[PDB]
Amino acid sequence: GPQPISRLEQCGINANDVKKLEEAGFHTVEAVAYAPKKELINIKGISEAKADKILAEAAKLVPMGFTTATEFHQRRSEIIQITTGSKELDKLLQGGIETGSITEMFGEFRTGKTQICHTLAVTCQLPIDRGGGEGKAMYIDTEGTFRPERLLAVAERYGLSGSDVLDNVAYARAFNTDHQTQLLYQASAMMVESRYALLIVDSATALYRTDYSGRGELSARQMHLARFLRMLLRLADEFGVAVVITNQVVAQFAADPKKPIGGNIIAHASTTRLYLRKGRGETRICKIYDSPCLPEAEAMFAINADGVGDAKD
Amino acid sequence: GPQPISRLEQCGINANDVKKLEEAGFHTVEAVAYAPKKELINIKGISEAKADKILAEAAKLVPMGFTTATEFHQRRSEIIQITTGSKELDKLLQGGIETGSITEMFGEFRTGKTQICHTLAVTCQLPIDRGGGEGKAMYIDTEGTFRPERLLAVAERYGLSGSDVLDNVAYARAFNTDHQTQLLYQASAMMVESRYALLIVDSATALYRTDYSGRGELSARQMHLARFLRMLLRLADEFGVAVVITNQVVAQFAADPKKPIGGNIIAHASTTRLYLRKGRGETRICKIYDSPCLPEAEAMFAINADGVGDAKD
Amino acid sequence: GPQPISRLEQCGINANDVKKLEEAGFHTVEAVAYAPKKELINIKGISEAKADKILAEAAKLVPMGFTTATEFHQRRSEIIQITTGSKELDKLLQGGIETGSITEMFGEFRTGKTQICHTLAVTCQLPIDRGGGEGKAMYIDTEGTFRPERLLAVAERYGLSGSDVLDNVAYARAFNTDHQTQLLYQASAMMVESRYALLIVDSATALYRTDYSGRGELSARQMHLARFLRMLLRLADEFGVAVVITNQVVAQFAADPKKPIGGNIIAHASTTRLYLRKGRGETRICKIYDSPCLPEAEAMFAINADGVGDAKD
Ligand SMILES: Nc1ncnc2c1ncn2[C@@H]1O[C@H](COP(=O)(O)OP(=O)(O)O)[C@@H](O)[C@H]1O
Ligand SMILES: Nc1ncnc2c1ncn2[C@@H]1O[C@H](COP(=O)(O)OP(=O)(O)O)[C@@H](O)[C@H]1O
Ligand SMILES: Nc1ncnc2c1ncn2[C@@H]1O[C@H](COP(=O)(O)OP(=O)(O)O)[C@@H](O)[C@H]1O
Ligand SMILES: [Ca+2]
Ligand SMILES: [Ca+2]
Ligand SMILES: [Ca+2]
């Protein structure tokens, strides 16, 4: 559980300015502790006089200094690996989708990217014993291709009350690139008033191929995309929630898998890349393209009327 | 072994001001001996009255005057060349990573930069007979892509106790440019209370492409980066420890290899540049871009589940 | 051979004050003869009473009055032109590096500035018949990029005993601007106890871009640099030794070649400027930017494992 921004009020910072820290999007103390000095002066009100003082006070409330690897080992061993819904993939991922980082699944059209995200939108409220996360979910949508009709079909596969499963998940369409980033600001708000566990952006680079569809602004197409993925990694180690993004890839304009999603400036954004491919048969393959800890391996899976599942045969 | 700042107390300097030398970041006597007169007056407390006196006393405790090349030859022949983990590269580097200077590996995405740094994070506590350094390690991380899961895999390749290997290494994430430089201050502290041998900044220019992502502050993007690489060369001849930084390079915003890492003001920062490139096959090549002593040569290597290794065939 | 300061003791000056002339840096009689009345009163001890008397006595010991051009012609024809190591450049320079003045080579990064200085650090102890100078050498270093590994490689190219070549050269790192100027004071000392022939400052303006890296002190960045180049021209006609400085230049903060090295107050410091540039091919060009006697011309050269050499083809 993070530390809300109200705890910083009693720490030595005024009240009229803490509300100003809020309007900038910062909702907790780690959000400012993970922020540089340059970003706080950009606020129209506050200046360098307080900015030194606030960041100094925030530093003590958030562990920021060095630490051992053993202490980081037993703390990294404790992160939740969200159940993928198919036992073959859990072994490929040594648990499943790992929270606190960016998970980027990219594959050709018709590969289950939309339904994998759907199945994950319910497997996250499963109890930890069931490999879940006991946390709320969120599914910001861009293609317009999300609908509860598939969610209750997966609740019955795992024995849940779909009446409350739809309550434990939120949703909003995205029409524009500026509305995609703006929606994260709102998203960053209600993640404080609750305990979400899985944000889903499907698809991330979808809306960037339609608005920024010119040849002169290829620079701006990535500058604006970088600012988007920045706050996404932001919200990942801020609330420690899993974030899963989606991309559509061509076989032969961030579509070439030879280049990462975060263009070149933020290319270190995605920490786990899963390439989804239809095999020679009617059976799907997930390939873990890059994840320092997990091998470059493969597994097979399939999709049923009840979500992601293991291969039939 | 350096000379701690406490030895300067008994040399003729007060106690309330030696604590002030500490708060400025100076932890030993060489740290002030390698400092100019301009930098000590910038302290809010002390003035030019003592600054002449302190630097005069520090001068005698640290060999500062001229010397012969023969005396520098046999003293430079004694520096440790950290074992790279692949025998082909030791010949390319005439030993491996040379301590007391800045080592900058830069290559395209997916080139082992992250895992080479990983393998070096254990090869440094090897005994000198095993080409190691018998010194602690440090891995300040920026991409978030570091994890012990690969370290114990390399300890078994060299026969070590991974339970203590993680104890002999420290680690901390970096989120902001101002937090990158601030973390060195803390780093400069616990390097006195122990004997580190290899600092690793991976990646150095990573966080400078995300915060300073505008067009007007291209000057400030390098001014702040210079102050970072300054203290890095600082800590290199201060404790005589090896410092290895990392950079991600585009094929076709310090990403063009035609320009050095330290922009233009501190461009003399990196003393050994190694360009990492995937060949026409599935085999990697390290090329020593610039190192006055080592030829502009090439070697091949590969990465396994147990760290950097020689080519399979 | 200069006249040491001890000869001034028997000339009519006391002993307790001649030691005071020493502590001020003045090691011979020309050093005070080339000094103004204003500079001697700045000493805490002596006053205008002796200052008139000392400078009057020093005047007779050092030829100071007028002279003909013929007498200056045959005396200027006798100055040594240090062999550059590449026959093409000797013709461009009508002999090579001319002693008794300031030689400033400036070029882009990766132009041989470091290795040209290296090759000159051995060509100076060559006998005069071999175009050398039969004098000791000195290489005060700032970038940290000097090492004997290249010196013995050039001794074998000219047939020398590298065991003694390193003895005939001295060296010291420079970390700060105040340590750069302070090192000249020591340098001015042991140049009396021996016969040096080539001082090398590589690079001169390097350390002035790191300490004086602010916007308010652009005045002080040159004031302090002027005091440095002052004593450098000082030591040039004092011991008549060659002094070669180095500068790193940007293509598009004394980096613009449109402005000289000595900023504006001492801009007459450098007497020969050589611009080093990588041509359209892998071959280097030296261009003599300014030298009243030598034409504005060009030549080509190259660098091998054995120092500066003529073009291969
Ligand atoms: N309700 C469903 N029940 C079963 N299979 C489905 C269902 N909807 C889609 N599929 C199958 O899953 C794939 C499409 O899933 P989807 O996640 O929408 O993929 P993508 O977004 O890549 O087009 C196709 O192979 C399709 O036959
Ligand atoms: N655990 C591992 N075991 C074996 N090979 C790995 C492992 N992790 C990554 N690799 C391989 O090494 C490269 C990635 O290494 P990494 O140091 O993370 O590179 P970079 O940071 O340049 O992306 C890829 O070729 C990948 O296949
Ligand atoms: N030991 C060496 N043997 C041969 N060529 C070298 C050697 N070291 C450097 N070079 C070459 O000389 C140039 C670098 O020389 P250097 O004097 O260090 O230049 P700069 O200081 O301008 O970077 C490059 O073209 C490099 O390929
Ligand atoms: Ca879809
Ligand atoms: Ca990396
Ligand atoms: Ca150089």
Side-chain angles (χ1 to χ4, degrees):
Chain A
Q3 293 177 335
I5 192 189
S6 64
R7 185 182 295 276
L8 163 83
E9 159 76 50
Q10 83 203 0
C11 272
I13 309 308
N14 289 339
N16 282 336
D17 321 328
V18 153
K19 293 179 179 179
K20 252 182 292 297
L21 295 174
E22 281 271 295
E23 69 163 39
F26 304 72
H27 282 295
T28 88
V29 194
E30 310 87 348
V32 201
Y34 295 157
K37 184 70 52 62
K38 178 189 66 61
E39 211 186 0
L40 289 164
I41 304 143
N42 268 359
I43 309 172
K44 268 188 177 177
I46 294 169
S47 151
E48 293 177 350
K50 292 259 291 166
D52 180 7
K53 293 179 179 179
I54 294 169
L55 254 164
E57 291 275 10
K60 347 172 186 163
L61 323 173
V62 179
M64 195 84 48
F66 270 87
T67 204
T68 58
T70 38
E71 293 177 350
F72 175 79
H73 202 37
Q74 223 65 45
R75 182 182 65 198
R76 171 172 188 55
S77 64
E78 293 177 350
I79 329 167
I80 294 169
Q81 268 147 332
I82 277 286
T83 169
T84 59
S86 87
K87 295 179 180 178
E88 280 316 290
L89 288 193
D90 289 345
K91 289 183 176 179
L92 173 77
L93 279 76
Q94 293 177 335
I97 298 314
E98 183 178 2
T99 81
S101 34
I102 294 169
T103 296
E104 176 227 32
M105 314 138 46
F106 62 100
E108 265 288 350
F109 184 40
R110 298 179 67 247
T111 34
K113 303 171 316 308
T114 313
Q115 303 274 330
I116 290 173
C117 291
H118 277 89
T119 317
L120 295 146
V122 175
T123 36
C124 86
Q125 311 103 350
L126 294 200
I128 300 136
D129 286 346
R130 303 198 62 190
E134 289 179 350
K136 274 202 81 163
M138 206 162 32
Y139 187 119
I140 171 181
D141 153 30
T142 58
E143 331 170 279
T145 73
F146 159 83
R147 42 192 59 101
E149 281 58 70
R150 285 285 290 119
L151 314 205
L152 319 88
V154 179
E156 272 192 351
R157 207 262 293 271
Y158 285 170
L160 295 174
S161 62
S163 64
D164 289 345
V165 180
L166 311 180
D167 292 309
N168 240 0
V169 175
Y171 154 80
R173 273 221 61 189
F175 322 101
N176 304 307
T177 59
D178 286 67
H179 180 227
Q180 203 176 351
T181 67
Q182 187 173 355
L183 224 62
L184 284 187
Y185 284 140
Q186 282 338 125
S188 174
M190 81 215 78
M191 300 203 43
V192 162
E193 312 183 334
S194 46
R195 164 211 71 261
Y196 293 100
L198 178 57
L199 171 59
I200 289 204
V201 175
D202 163 78
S203 309
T205 71
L207 292 183
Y208 281 102
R209 263 178 294 230
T210 325
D211 313 321
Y212 275 100
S213 198
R215 283 210 161 192
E217 64 264 12
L218 287 211
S219 199
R221 195 194 61 95
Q222 288 160 3
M223 183 66 75
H224 198 175
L225 178 47
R227 274 201 41 240
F228 176 67
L229 292 173
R230 203 201 162 180
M231 331 176 149
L232 267 180
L233 182 98
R234 185 57 57 85
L235 194 147
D237 289 345
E238 183 178 2
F239 304 141
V241 298
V243 159
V244 182
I245 43 158
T246 310
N247 188 341
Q248 183 284 300
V249 175
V250 305
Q252 168 156 334
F253 202 31
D256 258 314
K258 299 177 179 179
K259 294 282 211 43
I261 173 147
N264 249 302
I265 61 171
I266 198 74
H268 77 284
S270 68
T271 85
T272 294
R273 322 223 304 156
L274 314 178
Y275 174 44
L276 295 174
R277 199 184 33 55
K278 212 67 71 172
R280 277 193 172 179
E282 297 174 351
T283 52
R284 287 144 280 273
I285 302 136
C286 173
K287 183 178 179 180
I288 294 169
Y289 210 8
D290 289 345
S291 149
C293 55
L294 295 174
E296 183 178 2
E298 293 177 350
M300 292 177 72
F301 59 88
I303 321 156
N304 289 337
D306 289 345
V308 175
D310 318 273
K312 286 181 178 178
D313 285 331
Chain B
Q3 293 177 335
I5 192 189
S6 64
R7 185 182 295 276
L8 163 83
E9 159 76 50
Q10 83 203 0
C11 272
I13 309 308
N14 289 339
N16 282 336
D17 321 328
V18 153
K19 293 179 179 179
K20 252 182 292 297
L21 295 174
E22 281 271 296
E23 69 163 39
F26 304 72
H27 282 295
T28 88
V29 194
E30 310 87 348
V32 201
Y34 295 157
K37 184 70 52 62
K38 178 189 66 61
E39 211 186 0
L40 289 164
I41 304 143
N42 268 359
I43 309 172
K44 268 188 177 177
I46 294 169
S47 151
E48 293 177 350
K50 292 259 291 166
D52 180 7
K53 293 179 179 179
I54 294 169
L55 254 164
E57 291 275 10
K60 347 172 186 163
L61 323 173
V62 179
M64 195 84 48
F66 270 87
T67 204
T68 58
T70 38
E71 293 177 350
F72 175 79
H73 202 37
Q74 223 65 45
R75 182 182 65 198
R76 171 172 188 55
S77 64
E78 293 177 350
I79 329 167
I80 294 169
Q81 268 147 332
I82 277 286
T83 169
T84 59
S86 87
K87 295 179 180 178
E88 280 316 290
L89 288 193
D90 289 345
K91 289 183 176 179
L92 173 77
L93 279 76
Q94 293 177 335
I97 298 314
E98 183 178 2
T99 81
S101 34
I102 294 169
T103 296
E104 176 227 32
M105 314 138 46
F106 62 100
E108 265 288 350
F109 184 40
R110 298 179 67 247
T111 34
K113 303 171 316 308
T114 313
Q115 303 275 330
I116 290 173
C117 291
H118 277 89
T119 317
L120 295 146
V122 175
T123 36
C124 86
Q125 311 103 350
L126 294 200
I128 300 136
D129 286 346
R130 303 198 62 190
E134 289 179 350
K136 275 202 81 163
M138 206 162 32
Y139 187 119
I140 170 181
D141 153 30
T142 58
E143 331 170 279
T145 73
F146 158 83
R147 42 192 59 101
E149 281 59 70
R150 285 285 290 119
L151 314 205
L152 319 88
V154 179
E156 272 192 351
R157 207 262 293 271
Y158 285 170
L160 295 174
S161 62
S163 64
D164 289 345
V165 180
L166 311 180
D167 292 309
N168 241 0
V169 175
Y171 154 80
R173 273 221 61 189
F175 322 101
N176 304 307
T177 59
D178 287 67
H179 180 227
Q180 203 176 351
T181 67
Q182 187 173 355
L183 224 62
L184 284 187
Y185 284 140
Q186 282 338 125
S188 174
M190 81 215 78
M191 300 204 43
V192 162
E193 312 183 334
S194 46
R195 164 211 71 261
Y196 293 100
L198 178 57
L199 171 59
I200 289 204
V201 175
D202 163 78
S203 309
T205 71
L207 292 183
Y208 281 102
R209 263 178 294 230
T210 325
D211 313 321
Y212 275 100
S213 198
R215 283 210 161 193
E217 64 264 12
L218 287 211
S219 199
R221 195 194 61 95
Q222 288 160 3
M223 183 66 75
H224 198 175
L225 178 47
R227 274 201 41 241
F228 176 67
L229 292 173
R230 203 201 162 180
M231 331 176 149
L232 267 180
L233 182 98
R234 185 57 57 85
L235 194 147
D237 289 345
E238 183 178 2
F239 304 141
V241 298
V243 159
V244 182
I245 43 158
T246 309
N247 188 341
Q248 183 283 300
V249 175
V250 305
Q252 168 156 334
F253 202 31
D256 258 314
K258 299 177 179 179
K259 294 282 211 43
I261 173 147
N264 249 302
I265 61 171
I266 198 74
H268 77 284
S270 68
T271 85
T272 294
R273 322 223 304 156
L274 314 178
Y275 174 44
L276 295 174
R277 199 184 33 55
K278 212 67 71 172
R280 277 193 172 179
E282 297 174 351
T283 52
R284 287 144 280 273
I285 302 136
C286 173
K287 183 178 179 180
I288 294 169
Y289 210 8
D290 289 345
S291 149
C293 55
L294 295 174
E296 183 178 2
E298 293 177 350
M300 292 177 72
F301 59 88
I303 321 156
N304 289 337
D306 289 345
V308 175
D310 318 273
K312 286 181 178 178
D313 285 331
Chain C
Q3 293 177 335
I5 192 189
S6 64
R7 185 182 295 276
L8 163 83
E9 159 76 49
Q10 83 203 0
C11 272
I13 309 308
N14 289 339
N16 282 336
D17 321 328
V18 153
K19 293 179 179 179
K20 252 182 292 297
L21 295 174
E22 281 271 295
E23 69 163 39
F26 303 72
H27 282 295
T28 88
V29 194
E30 310 87 348
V32 201
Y34 295 157
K37 184 70 52 62
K38 178 189 66 61
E39 211 186 0
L40 289 164
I41 304 143
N42 268 359
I43 309 172
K44 268 188 177 177
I46 294 169
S47 151
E48 293 177 350
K50 292 259 291 166
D52 180 7
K53 293 179 179 179
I54 294 169
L55 254 164
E57 291 275 10
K60 347 172 185 163
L61 323 173
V62 179
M64 195 84 48
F66 270 87
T67 204
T68 58
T70 38
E71 293 177 350
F72 175 79
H73 202 37
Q74 223 65 45
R75 182 182 65 198
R76 171 172 188 55
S77 64
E78 293 177 350
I79 329 167
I80 294 169
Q81 268 147 332
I82 277 286
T83 169
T84 59
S86 87
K87 295 178 180 178
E88 280 316 290
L89 288 193
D90 289 345
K91 289 183 176 179
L92 173 77
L93 279 76
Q94 293 177 335
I97 298 314
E98 183 178 2
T99 81
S101 34
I102 294 169
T103 296
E104 176 227 32
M105 314 138 46
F106 62 100
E108 265 288 350
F109 184 40
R110 298 179 67 247
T111 34
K113 303 171 316 308
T114 313
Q115 303 275 330
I116 290 173
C117 291
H118 277 89
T119 317
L120 295 146
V122 175
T123 36
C124 86
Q125 311 103 350
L126 294 200
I128 300 136
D129 286 346
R130 303 198 62 190
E134 289 179 350
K136 274 202 81 163
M138 206 162 32
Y139 187 119
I140 171 181
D141 153 30
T142 58
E143 331 170 279
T145 73
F146 159 83
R147 42 192 59 101
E149 281 58 70
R150 285 285 290 119
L151 314 205
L152 319 88
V154 179
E156 272 192 351
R157 207 262 293 271
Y158 285 170
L160 295 174
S161 62
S163 64
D164 289 345
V165 180
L166 311 180
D167 292 309
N168 240 0
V169 175
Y171 154 80
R173 273 221 61 189
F175 322 101
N176 304 307
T177 59
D178 286 67
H179 180 227
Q180 203 176 351
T181 67
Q182 187 173 355
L183 224 62
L184 284 187
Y185 284 140
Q186 282 338 125
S188 174
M190 81 215 78
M191 300 204 43
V192 162
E193 312 183 334
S194 46
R195 164 211 71 261
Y196 293 100
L198 178 57
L199 171 59
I200 289 204
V201 175
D202 163 78
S203 309
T205 71
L207 292 183
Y208 281 102
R209 263 178 294 230
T210 325
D211 313 321
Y212 275 100
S213 198
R215 283 210 161 193
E217 64 264 12
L218 287 211
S219 199
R221 195 194 61 95
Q222 288 160 3
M223 183 66 75
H224 198 175
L225 178 47
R227 274 201 41 240
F228 176 67
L229 292 173
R230 203 201 162 180
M231 331 176 149
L232 267 180
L233 182 98
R234 185 57 57 85
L235 194 147
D237 289 345
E238 183 178 2
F239 304 141
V241 298
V243 159
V244 182
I245 43 158
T246 309
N247 188 341
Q248 183 283 300
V249 175
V250 305
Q252 168 156 334
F253 202 31
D256 258 314
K258 299 177 179 179
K259 294 282 211 43
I261 173 147
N264 249 302
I265 61 171
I266 198 74
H268 77 284
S270 68
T271 85
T272 294
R273 322 223 304 156
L274 314 178
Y275 174 44
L276 295 174
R277 199 184 33 55
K278 212 67 71 172
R280 277 193 172 179
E282 297 174 351
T283 52
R284 287 144 280 273
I285 302 137
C286 173
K287 183 178 179 180
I288 294 169
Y289 210 8
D290 289 345
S291 149
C293 55
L294 295 174
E296 183 178 2
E298 293 177 350
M300 292 177 72
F301 59 88
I303 321 156
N304 289 337
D306 289 345
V308 175
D310 318 273
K312 286 181 178 178
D313 285 331

